[PDB]
Amino acid sequence: MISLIAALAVDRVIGMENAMPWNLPADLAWFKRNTLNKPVIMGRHTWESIGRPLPGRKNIILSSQPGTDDRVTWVKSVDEAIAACGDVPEIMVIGGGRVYEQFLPKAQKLYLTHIDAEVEGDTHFPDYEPDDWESVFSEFHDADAQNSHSYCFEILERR
Ligand SMILES: NC(=O)c1ccc[n+]([C@@H]2O[C@H](COP(=O)([O-])OP(=O)(O)OC[C@H]3O[C@@H](n4cnc5c(N)ncnc54)[C@H](OP(=O)(O)O)[C@@H]3O)[C@@H](O)[C@H]2O)c1
Ligand SMILES: Nc1nc(=O)c2nc(CNc3ccc(C(=O)N[C@@H](CCC(=O)O)C(=O)O)cc3)cnc2[nH]1
Ligand SMILES: [Mn+2]
Ligand SMILES: [Mn+2]
Ligand SMILES: [Mn+2]
Numbered sequence: 764m765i766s767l768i769a770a771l772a773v774d775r776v777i778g779m780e781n782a783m784p785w786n787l788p789a790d791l792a793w794f795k796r797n798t799l800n801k802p803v804i805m806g807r808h809t810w811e812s813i814g815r816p817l818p819g820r821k822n823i824i825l826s827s828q829p830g831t832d833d834r835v836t837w838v839k840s841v842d843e844a845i846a847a848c849g850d851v852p853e854i855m856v857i858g859g860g861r862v863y864e865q866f867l868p869k870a871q872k873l874y875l876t877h878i879d880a881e882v883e884g885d886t887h888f889p890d891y892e893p894d895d896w897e898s899v900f901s902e903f904h905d906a907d908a909q910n911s912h913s914y915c916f917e918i919l920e921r922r
Pocket of ligand 3: 840842
């Protein structure tokens, strides 16, 4: 099973200048809980944005060019990325925009955080078709001293 996990600001913005400008510790904790002990697939730009391997997860990087770091696994196509995960129950695709576009048709589940923040961005989460997806979990949180915007955790499953 393939799942996508992402945090979206207003208008589906996910990034600006290869960075995420907001800081929401509760959402990073949600990201860790839902990805730990699973393989994670990311594109090369997202690898450069994170800047280090994510511990406790098999890190798989998509790039057309040879890898430059043997602490992670480098693959050259979507099919190779999936194969490199082996026989696991759930593969987590962690972006960025171009990678989400390619894996969305193959995904059964979306883990989305909707952040109430207006962000100038240059990268967006793909338009998906709402009729194809059923919301099976949602949890709203007001802003607090640690998290400066309100946010909604949602899990959607392909109908
Ligand atoms: N808010 C969130 O949830 C979230 C999550 C992830 C990322 N982001 C943000 O998203 C932005 C990065 O997204 P992006 O769309 O620019 O880049 P991306 O999807 O991270 O990376 C694209 C790169 O991945 C490689 N790639 C993708 N598909 C491939 C394929 N089929 N075969 C081989 N290589 C492939 C290529 O690398 P080569 O050029 O080396 O071939 C391509 O240039 C940043 O702003 C980051 O902060 C946000
Ligand atoms: N909901 C969501 N939020 C994100 O921030 C996010 N980020 C990415 C890609 N970028 C990043 C950037 C930083 C870390 C990171 O530092 N993660 C730590 C945080 C642990 C914690 O804060 O408790 C990790 O070990 O996962 C992960 C992914 C992909 N999907 C996402 N999905
Ligand atoms: Mn092929
Ligand atoms: Mn197999
Ligand atoms: Mn806000």
